[PDB]
């Protein structure tokens, strides 16, 4: 069904490990949850009120409020189970498991996209601003400063008073991981011809952060594949929705830029993080000749994949939105990670 992402060096066995932050070592007592496990279980438990509120007002679901209560109860219980017995529910837990358990409880109860209304609203608002935001980057004369502005836009989108205001209020550099000078140096040779980008959120993120950047790549002669979730997870953009957005924004051009080398791919993913050892054949086919792999957002690029080694150049770019993640990295809440590995 699924296959390894082609830019992972083979053998991936005993080399690729998706999850970045370990919670347990083999020598730890197997019958007692560890401190990191308790910490991270608590992160997920602390998400329950927001997910319950969103679920309960999902009017597309009959008797959403009762179902949302059952979600909050069932997921809270699974999490307390894991604190008492790390081997329960398919543990010991890692970030992928905790994410997946949350999605399963919701989906079993018949929820399919509790964020759909808000996603649609945020996409609509962003689409109205696309020409304005793109104009501002197009106005910048120097190609390297333009890149920097687009990179700041990716970070701002990944948190978003306005999107453009947020571009100007990022934490000051140096960033916690700051490889932008190196990346800019290579970008100005125009040496990349095949970019693959694992996208994250709907709304400003995909439309005002990612898409202008993608457009700049196209303009500089690169092919760009945008890889998105198959299934809804939180407010993350799915392949289906991104196809609709592109149709909406497009002489089939994006503000005078041809999109014949812009491809939208279903990654096969259904979480807010990603295990790159299991991606769709569609994506594997479209990524078999990639020479830049970009992984966006804290879930896909930081909590997973931050230290993943690729056969080609790779960039992990995202804003830090968990204190526990900031702690792990020795950075600030809202710190920016721009981690670039050449060769
Ligand atoms: Mg997201
Ligand atoms: Mg997460």
Swiss-Prot record:
Mn(2+) binds at residues 200-201, 236. A motif (Subfamily II EGMGR motif) lies at residues 296-300. Activity is strongly promoted by Co(2+), Ni(2+), Mg(2+), Cu(2+) and Mn(2+). Activity is inhibited by EDTA. Its cofactor is Mn(2+); Ni(2+). One of its GO terms (cellular component) is mitochondrion. GO terms for biological process: coenzyme A biosynthetic process. Phosphatase activity is strongly promoted by several divalent cations but it is suggested that Mn(2+) and possibly Ni(2+) represent biologically relevant metal ion cofactors for damage-control phosphatases. Pfam families: ARMT1-like_dom (PF01937). It is an enzyme of class 3 (hydrolase). Changing residue 201 to A: Abolishes catalytic activity. Keywords: Acetylation, Hydrolase, Manganese, Metal-binding, Nickel. Gene3D superfamilies: AF1104-like, Uncharacterised protein PF01937, DUF89, domain 2, Uncharacterised protein PF01937, DUF89, domain 3. One of its GO terms (molecular function) is hydrolase activity. The keyword Acetylation applies. Its EC number is 3.1.3.-. InterPro entries: ARMT-1-like_metal-bd_sf (IPR036075), ARMT1-like_metal-bd (IPR002791), At2g17340 (IPR016949), At2g17340_3_helix_bundle (IPR035073), Type_II_PanK (IPR004567). It comes from the Eukaryota. Multimer. Belongs to the damage-control phosphatase family. Phosphopantetheine phosphatase II subfamily. Subfamily II proteins have an EGMGR motif about 50 residues from the C-terminus. This motif lies near the metal-binding residues in the putative substrate-binding cleft 2. Subfamily II proteins occur only in eukaryotes, in two forms: as a stand-alone unit in plants, and as a C-terminal domain of pantothenate kinases in plants, animals, and chytrid fungi. This is Damage-control phosphatase At2g17340.
